[PDB]
């Protein structure tokens, strides 16, 4: 489906499902990593899907610091909250029930308000405020770089707008089993993930890359 | 408590409501002003005999423009409404149970969501915050708003005295009479600095001659 | 020129220059004061100039707390700064000189930057940053409600977009002399100012107002 | 200083540059990870014999994504550039005089303005702030940026050790060699946790057997 293509490359590389990509040469390795952080419209490196429609900065999700990756970023949390709200909208028997419950709870407070001396006014209580007040956030149970990768994988999956995930030099932290559970999940869930590796990652189906930008396959 | 300074033979006593007329245009302006710039060694003094710090004094000049929806005041209102429920365990308990139901319907959405989500609680305080309860001021009459200023004043426990500058001019005798009753009832300490005599309530007067009188007792 | 007109009024009141306006009745007094704080499009009270073009919330400047009035509000300061900048633009021989001076001063710093280890980049230094850095602000010398009124008057004058000033119940703080110096300045500077007073302000030309909304003049 | 924990017969010594290879995939991951969650009683230890607090340790995993334009770092850069002038009184003095001229042309505009305006001074620090001097990163190579991380590291005096996780993979031997020279020259203390041997520099190795070796001395 997806392509990694730029000037110095013979053929555009296929990014289909899980994909390990070795860049033997230290210089091509950094060049490519860095062209990744530097990804933008004006960029050396182009990623695009089958329809040749190019993946934008925003659609890529790039991880080098696996531990550092924040699963409860505000950006993620806003989305989750907004998402949980729209779940309600699609079950109208429950939004009705939420509505009745808030309407009632509101009166009971306004009751105390009327009771209070002050001329007190008020707005409404929204589903979002309830979710936000409840403190819904992503579970952080993973206590290992490996467990973490899976969570990053889960989240990547969860963000429908993030289309490609790139782990950079992540092989270093992963038993052959772990790498396989990962690729397992990635097959299972239909994720396009790229692993920019500096050396061969065990004996998994994977692509390699000369200092000359010549492309061999391996372990098929 | 007391108001004192150098020109006064003897300090002025501030229990509950205390109306102070200054009829010398220039002494009115000096005293209102000294009040406003009040500090540790200001020319003008206030005390219990421990002197009131500035921070323990609120001063209202512009009534309608005074913000009674300050954070500290909201925070206070809100904990007060909450605590109104601790007097009504019956209803509070229903609220706990209603909140539990919302919680459950939300957690169910949380499970049904692909992500492994955790959560905490929803508290009555959060519901109150969420509801955006605040004092309504936008339509007020000066009188209505004086009352609100008084009502919020009771909360600021830190503050010991509230001063009203030249508010009389805006008030019907009956309105003034209301606020006295309320001041008296709420065990509050309040001063109205006036240019002129305020109808016929008990009040103090200092003239051009600087002779301090007492009236309508 | 300007008019104070609303429903309960016989004739629209002329606001020309300084203007004292007594509202004998406690109720009409508050009603009117309050209709002032509550001024907006949907409002009881209308102010408009000669061309019957109505003065907006923003064009009025309403003072009850004379001491409290902040002459160094951010809003005032932004304007002053922006204004001082445009002074420069209109003296091109001086903007040239400012320009030469900054361009030079910049190099001398960039010089130190080049000298510094780090790859350091930089932007520019603007006239505004110079003004802001210099800490230009309005002088606060007035140590009396009276001195203050004059400063508020100066500022009112300074804001070309603020078209009417209303002092509310300010008479209370003002010797007959002071009131006169004020009206003096207001004549001198061409200001439209209104003094909502609850009682007669000495013996100055002024308008009075019945509990019935009947309008007499006085002291002409 | 030193890195120590339970599996090590004897602590590892951290003077200047110190490269530490962990070749057991699982011990690499454990140690990188322990580093990251380091605290008071973490499994992993660091000390002078007073242990380094977490706050005294900076850790780089994502090189290009690390923010060297932090407030604390800018604040520091800027006071350093200023102080570069105190070594050049001649030029500084011209700058004082140039600034005085701008000041004067501004004050003149201040007088010419209808309002009575006051003012303070313009300082070199303000000019530097205004100028928006910061480290340029936007075009960096990983190597270039390591260098900048090092260069800013010298400033944070609070921090005692900087750790680089698995940065080797990105670096030419000659690039690595550069950063060693610079570390050595700047009297800095630095650790590179590596999965594999880093070319042929002096470095420490811990294997699957957990046998600690020393190499290329
Ligand atoms: Ca709300
Ligand atoms: Ca909560
Ligand atoms: Ca009200
Ligand atoms: Ca700038
Ligand atoms: Ca300055
Ligand atoms: Ca650079």
Residue numbers in the entry:
A (entry chain B), C (entry chain B): 0 to 219
B (entry chain A), D (entry chain A): 1 to 48, 51 to 219
Give the published text.
Csn2 is one of four Cas proteins that comprise the Nmeni subtype of the CRISPR/Cas system. The tetrameric nature of S. pyogenes Csn2 results in a diamond-shaped ring structure with a positively charged inner surface as seen in E. faecalis Csn2.
The only CA2 site in the asymmetric unit of the S. pyogenes Csn2 structure is located adjacent to one of the two hinge regions in monomer A. The calcium ion in the CA2 site is coordinated by three residues (Glu138, Asp142, and Glu150) from monomer A, Asp118 from monomer B of the symmetry-related dimer, and two water molecules. In the corresponding hinge region of monomer B in the asymmetric unit, we were unable to locate a calcium ion. The absence of calcium could also be a simple artifact caused by release of the calcium ion from the more exposed binding site during purification. It is important to note that the lack of a calcium ion is not a result of the selenomethionine (SeMet) labeling as our 2.9 Å native data also indicated the absence of calcium at this site. In contrast, we purified and crystallized S. pyogenes Csn2 without the addition of excess calcium ions.
